[model samples]
Target: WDGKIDGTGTHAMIVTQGVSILENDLSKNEPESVRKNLEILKENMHELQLGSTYPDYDKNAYDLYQDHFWDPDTDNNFSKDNSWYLAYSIPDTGESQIRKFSALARYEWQRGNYKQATFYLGEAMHYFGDIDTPYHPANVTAVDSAGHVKFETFAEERKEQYKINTAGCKTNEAFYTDILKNKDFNAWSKEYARGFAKTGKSIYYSHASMSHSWDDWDYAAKVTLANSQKGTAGYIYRFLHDVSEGNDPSVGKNVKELVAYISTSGEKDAGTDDYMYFGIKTKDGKTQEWEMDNPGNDFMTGSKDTYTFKLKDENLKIDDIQNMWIRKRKYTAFSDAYKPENIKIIANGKVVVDKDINEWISGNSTYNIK
Candidate 1:
C-alpha cells in the first residue's frame, strides 16, 4: 500500500503462495504430465484469482447460486438437488461445474490436447484453493465471492503474520493425494464453514454489527487459513531514518513499550525481524499492523513514546519515501490516543530520530537532520 495505507490489502498474493506450496507438494514424483501441467497453472495463477472476472461467469448463473445454497429441500423445481462442486464460489450449491471441467479435461485428453486438459485442471484447482478461504462462504453484506474479495483486500499485506501451521497443509493433502475421497472434500468444506461462522460472529459483535467493515472480520477470519492471530503476526520490523508528523495540526504522541524482533543470528521462536518494512496507515484508519512475510522475525525491543517513522533508501527522494513507525502497544479505544515514552531512529549507519519520553508527542521534534 502507499503511505495512505500500511503495507496490507493485496489479495491473491496469499493465494498464489498457497498454490506454490501445493505445487511443490504435487510436483514431486508424479507423472511428468501431471507435474508439467501444474507448472503451467502457476504461471496462470493471476487468472485463477480473477476467475469471477472471466467472460464465462454470468447473471442468470448468479441468481441460481443465490437461490440454491446446496439445500436439497429448498429445490422443489429440480429432479434431485445437485450440489455445486465448488460450494462457496460461483454456483451456490447447485451446479455441475466440476463435471463440466472434468468432462472437458477428458474431451481434451481424447483429442490429445494435453495443454487444454491442463487448463481445465488448473481451473479445478483454483476453486479448490478458493473454497479454503474463510470469507468466501459467509455471504454477509456481500455475496459469496464479494466478501471473498473483501477478505483478500487486506490479507495480501499481512502475509508473514501467518505462521502457517503444518495442519493447514494436512487439510488439502487429502484432496490432491492418491486416494481422493468425498470425505476429504466434506471435511475441508467444514473447515471453510468453521472460519465462516467465526467471521460471522465477529461481524455480529463488531462496532457496526452487520453494516461494519468486512476488513476486521476478514482479519480475524484469516486464522482458518493462516496463523495470524497471536504471536508475531501483529508486529512489523522497521528500519527508519527519520520521524516526523505530516500535516498534523495538533501535537500528539505515538509510543510506549518497544518490541524488538528477537535477534536474526537465530533466536528460533521465529528467527529474526527480517525485511525492509514500511508501516502505513490506511485510508480506513486501522493500522493494519501489517508485516510482509515475503522475506519475512523476532522482537528486536525498545521504547519510543509517540514516535513516527521514515525509511530512506539510497535513492529516496526528499519529498517521497517508503517507511515505518512504532508505538508502545497499548491500543483499544475510540479516543485512546497517547504518546510513546521514548523514541529512537537509526538511519542505517546513525541515529536520525531519537526522542525522550513524551517529547515526540509534543510535536516539538523535527526529525530531519542535515
Candidate 2:
C-alpha cells in the first residue's frame, strides 16, 4: 500500500503539512497578518495541483525542471520524475527562478494585492522545498517515487510514533540566524541548494540504515524532514522579512539591471542536456559573471531569457556598458554563442545594449570577466 493519504482522497499530505508549517511560521499563535494570508494561501493551494486536477493540463516546462543532475549515465533517464535543467546563474527563458521571488514580491506589492502576493510567493518557495526533499532532485534506490514517499511516510510514522506535530521554523539557531541575514537571493539560494543537497546526500546514505520495512523509516524521515525545514520555511521567512524591510529589488543598491542575454554552446543526449553562464561589465570598471557548473542546465536553445531596467529619477547609469560575454563558472562547463549574439535591455520605453556583445562578445569563446 502507498499508505493512507488524508484530507481529499487525491490530496497530497506534503501540501497539507507545508501549508501548516507556513501557518505556524507566520504565526506562532495565529496573528491577523497570518490569518488573512493563510486564507488566500489555502485558496491558492489548488494552483499547484493542476497536474492532478486536469489530466490534459499543459504543464510549464521550466517550473517542472527540478533535478540539477550531473551523472550523464542517468541524466537522460526520464523516469517517474525527470524533465529539465537549465544552465547559467539564471535561465534563458521560462520559469527559471531568476528574480522569481523578488519579481513576485515587487509585482504584488505594487498592485496592493496581498492574496496573490502570498500565494505566488508560496509558489516561489515550492522550488526551495523541492530542493530540500531528496527524492524530487535525485532518484532513491526504491522504485518510482518510493524513495521519496518512504521518507515522507517515515516522517508521518514518526510524527505518530513520538506524537510529533509540525515544524514551523528550523531549530538550528546559529546556522540559519547567520545565514538568513544575507539578502543576496542569487548567492544565498545557491548556497542553500548546496546545504539541501547535503541533506539529499544524507538521505541516500540513509539507505544503509534502511530496509524494506518501516523499521528504519523513522530515522530516514527524521533526517528528511529536519533538513527540508529551513529551505522551505526560510524562503517564507525571508519573503516576509525582505518585504518588511521595504526591499525593492528593481531599485536596490545591490541590484543590477544587466540583461542575461542568453545564446547557447553545446550538449544533448536530448536537447535539454545543455549548459549556461552570464557576464556583464560596467563602464566604471566593475565586472560580474555567473555560470552553471555541473549537470549542464536544461536550457532549450535560442531561448528568450530577457531583462529590463528603468531608472526613476535615480542617478544610476546604464547608458554605457564596457564588455560582456558568455560567463564562466568557477567549477562548471562553459559554452559558445551560436550567432546573432544579441541582447535587448528594456525599461521605461528605453533600452540599452553592449553593441560589442552582439559583434564580437557572444560567441563560442568563454569569458573570464573580473
lDDT at position 43, candidate 1:
63
List model 2 lDDT by residue over 265-343, tens digit each.
2222112333345555667766554543333233344333333221122343444345655532222254433332334
Model 1, clash count? Answer: 29
Maximum-lDDT candidate: 2
Q: How close is candidate 1 to the true structure, as a TM-score?
A: 0.34
Clash total of candidate 2: 8
Cα deviation at 212, candidate 2, in Å, is 7.5
**CA lDDT scores, all candidates in order:** 0.30, 0.40
| Stretches of candidate 1 exceeding 4 Å from the true structure | 1-11, 43-99, 102-106, 109-139, 143-152, 156-219, 226-370
lDDT of model 2, residue 326: 55
Model 1, span 18-49: residue lDDT tens: 45544444424445544444455456555533
